[PDB]
């Protein structure tokens, strides 16, 4: 719940190792976990808040000019000077024009000339940085098992809104009864700050990395402005017209807000009005789950005469939900839910609500479960067999495995070696795979990066051809490995 229809959702099986399960979760998706007991929790990530930023840089985007002084010496005696070249607030440039008696001076040469202009600034880029503290991730962890009002509605108080910061720890959270859950986040292995720059324009903000933002044109100014206006650039902005021979002139280059946006394509955007409201990015929890009842075992198989009040409602490969309305004298009991096959009973499904439970009286409790890939009879009644429902999950086994392989390829994509940490309880194989892909993606790190969609797929096809030319069985670690990783990376990036 709070997790239905938000597809790309991260099913997690297994709790072994005692209780610890490694989960990598991000703003876009959410994670549903399972175990043989200890009922299914839902991990949705919501807003990140970096509390205390520090302003590192001001770029001017629109500028205007005034007071427009200029001067010229004489033909080759004197190179011109001007007293308002003294301020660096003025922009200045030397050039050479021509001079003669017509101009008045004498000696008929190509004499030097200066021009000067006062530099005033319009609205700016207010680029800031944040340390890898003063930032909190807010995670709503919410349980299944009933409580209508909406298997969606992330707004609402059913799942606790627990904060976490790198100045914090094991993240103890409490729920109704059973839900003492401890979460050990590792936020420093997340976005890897001290390589980030939040970038605020007039209304919006973006998250761009640091070297690019330092390397960008559109005049420099450091964070100690106040009475600054000391812009140490302006060859990238204001341009000086020089016609054929005579007097040169100043030209404001105009607002580069559109060119700025075209520059920061391929970068995630962010609302930043109230301090900060940082979004899309991932983090890595280790999850410990001892401390968990099943919201009572402590009950009976119920009497009977249930009633559906909602449809069949298939979501996203198998997860189907059914909202039943108990009728009778329950004194709240369990719900005898089963997913069976046909006659000569071969009961084969799974229930992801584990131990669903009726509330006090009439209240439309709802149940999600996964049938197999074909025919299925979902049954809920007992003594007069009360209610069966037919259902046909279209599916496949092979198609399900192939889609899971595509999910694993997308995890070999965007989220890095954290996606090797996305499983759990792996011991030897998972850890050695994470270390091997760590050093391997480090070699394919910076290290052949910085390239666009087109050039990546083109360098992929040329390197897969030179692998196809087949010398001495280097063609494998060439051609097939490199062609797979380049193509399945290039067609998936720039999202």
């Amino acid at each position: 719940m709070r997790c239905i229809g938000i597809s790309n959702r991260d099913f997690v099986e297994g709790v072994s190792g005692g209780s610890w399960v490694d989960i990598v979760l991000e703003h876009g998706s959410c994670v549903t976990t399972m175990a043989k007991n200890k009922p299914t929790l839902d991990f949705e990530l919501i807003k990140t808040e970096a509390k205390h930023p520090a302003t590192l840089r001001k770029y001017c985007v629109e500028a205007k000019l005034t007071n427009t002084t200029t001067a010229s010496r004489c033909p080759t005696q004197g190179e011109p000077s001007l007293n308002e070249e003294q301020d660096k607030r003025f922009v200045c440039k030397h050039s050479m024009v021509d001079r003669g008696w017509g101009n008045g001076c004498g000696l008929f040469g190509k004499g030097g000339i200066v021009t000067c202009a006062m530099f005033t600034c319009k609205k700016n880029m207010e680029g800031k940085v944040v340390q890898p503290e003063n930032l909190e991730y807010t995670i709503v962890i919410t349980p299944h098992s009933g409580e209508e009002n909406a298997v969606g509605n992330d707004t609402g108080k059913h799942g606790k809104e627990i904060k976490v910061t790198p100045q914090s720890s094991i993240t103890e959270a409490e729920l109704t009864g059973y839900g003492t859950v401890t979460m050990e986040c590792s936020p420093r292995t997340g976005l890897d700050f001290n390589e980030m720059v939040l970038l605020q324009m007039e209304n919006k903000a973006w998250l761009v990395h640091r070297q690019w933002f330092l390397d960008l044109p559109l005049p420099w100014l450091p964070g100690a402005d106040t009475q600054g206006s000391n812009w140490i650039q302006k060859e990238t902005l204001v341009t000086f017209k020089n016609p054929h021979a005579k007097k040169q002139d100043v030209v404001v280059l105009g607002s580069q807000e559109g060119a700025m946006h075209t520059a920061l394509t391929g970068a995630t955007e962010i609302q930043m009005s109230s301090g900060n409201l940082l979004f899309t990015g991932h983090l890595k929890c280790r999850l410990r789950m001892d401390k968990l009842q099943l919201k009572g075992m402590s009950y009976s198989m119920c009497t009977g005469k249930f009633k559906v009040v909602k449809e069949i409602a298939e979501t996203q490969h198998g997860t189907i939900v059914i909202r039943v309305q108990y009728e009778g004298d329950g004194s709240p009991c369990k719900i005898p839910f089963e997913i069976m096959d046909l006659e000569k009973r071969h009961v084969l499904g799974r229930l992801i609500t584990v131990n669903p439970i009726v509330t006090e009286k009439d209240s439309p409790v709802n149940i999600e479960a996964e049938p197999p890939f074909g025919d299925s009879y979902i049954i809920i009644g007992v003594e007069p067999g009360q209610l069966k429902l037919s259902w046909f999950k279209k599916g496949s086994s092979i198609g399900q495995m192939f889609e899971t392989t595509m999910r694993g390829a997308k995890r070999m994509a965007i989220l890095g070696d954290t996606a090797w940490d996305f499983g759990s309880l792996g011991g030897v194989f998972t850890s050695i795979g994470k270390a091997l892909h760590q050093v391997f993606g480090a070699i394919y790190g910076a290290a052949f990066s910085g390239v666009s969609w087109t050039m990546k797929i083109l360098i992929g096809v040329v390197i897969t051809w030179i692998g196809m030319n087949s010398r001495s069985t280097s063609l494998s670690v060439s051609l097939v490995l490199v062609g797979v990783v380049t193509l399945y990376l290039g067609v998936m990036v720039q999202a």
Partner: antibody, heavy 132, light 107 residues
Framework: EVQLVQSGPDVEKPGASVKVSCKAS????????IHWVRQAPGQGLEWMGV????????ASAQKFQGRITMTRDTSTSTVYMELSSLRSDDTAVYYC?????????????????????????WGQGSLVTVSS | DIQLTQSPSSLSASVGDRVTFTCQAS??????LNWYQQKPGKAPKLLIY???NLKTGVPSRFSGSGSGTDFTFTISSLQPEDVATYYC?????????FGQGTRLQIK
């Protein structure tokens, strides 16, 4: 003793610039920052800006963007504030004190506090009136 | 920014009363707060630093408390030399902002 002394009250023209001094006594002049705070009579207090005596970096608030300048004299242990583009709203009482010092340079907040803003060492007050 | 609201704006009380002031911040200012008195047209004086600590030379009738955003200043026994305008002040994040003020009147 622990003491600061400011200059006398001044009256200037609109669009002019005014200079207010702040002389120190009783301590080592590069062991504290100096900060300038205004107060209009029909208003409470309002922060203008910050200078460091050791070295001489400055900063100021956004309401004084490009209107204020801060210098010093280490030999006389004195801090000068110069407010430019005077208008009628600038008629106020001016104040200058001492911050506990991140040794090198200004504007820090994480060393446990400044510790006053600004009434322990501060002085006697400079009234500035912008009129014709 | 960090809007700092000071409440109430003005009070009147008799000599010997206990009076409390409340300042609220729009952000977390966890301990960075200061309390000042100001005698009108005079040279004013610090009362409380770090929102909990007396300055040496200040009498013990003054106190302050509060952690998150809401802060309480307290005079235990009001005395006739304590008629002043009282200010609370944030120190955090440095567009340094004062409270509006709180005037006192002796009954």
């Amino acid at each position: 003793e622990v003491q600061l002394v400011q200059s006398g009250p001044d009256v200037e023209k609109p669009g002019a610039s005014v200079k207010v001094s702040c002389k120190a006594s009783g301590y080592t002049f590069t062991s504290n920052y100096i900060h300038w705070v205004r107060q209009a009579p029909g208003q409470g207090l309002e922060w203008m800006g910050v200078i460091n005596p050791r070295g001489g970096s400055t900063a100021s608030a956004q309401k004084f963007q490009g209107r204020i300048t801060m210098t010093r004299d280490t030999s006389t242990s004195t801090v000068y504030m110069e407010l430019s583009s005077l208008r009628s709203d600038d008629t106020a009482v001016y104040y200058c004190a001492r911050g506990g010092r991140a040794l090198f340079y200004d504007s820090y907040t994480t060393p446990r506090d400044g510790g006053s803003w600004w009434f322990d060492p501060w002085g006697q007050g400079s009234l500035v009136t912008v009129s014709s | 920014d960090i809007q700092l609201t000071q409440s109430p704006s003005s009070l009147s009380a008799s000599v010997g009363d206990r009076v409390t002031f409340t300042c609220q911040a729009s952000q977390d200012i966890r301990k960075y707060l200061n309390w000042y008195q100001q005698k009108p047209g005079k040279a004013p004086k610090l009362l409380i630093y770090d929102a909990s600590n007396l300055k040496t030379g200040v009498p013990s009738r003054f106190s302050g408390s509060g952690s998150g955003t809401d802060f309480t200043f307290t005079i235990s026994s009001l005395q006739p030399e304590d008629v002043a305008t009282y200010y609370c002040q944030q120190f955090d994040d440095l567009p340094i902002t004062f409270g509006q003020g709180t005037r006192l009147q002796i009954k």
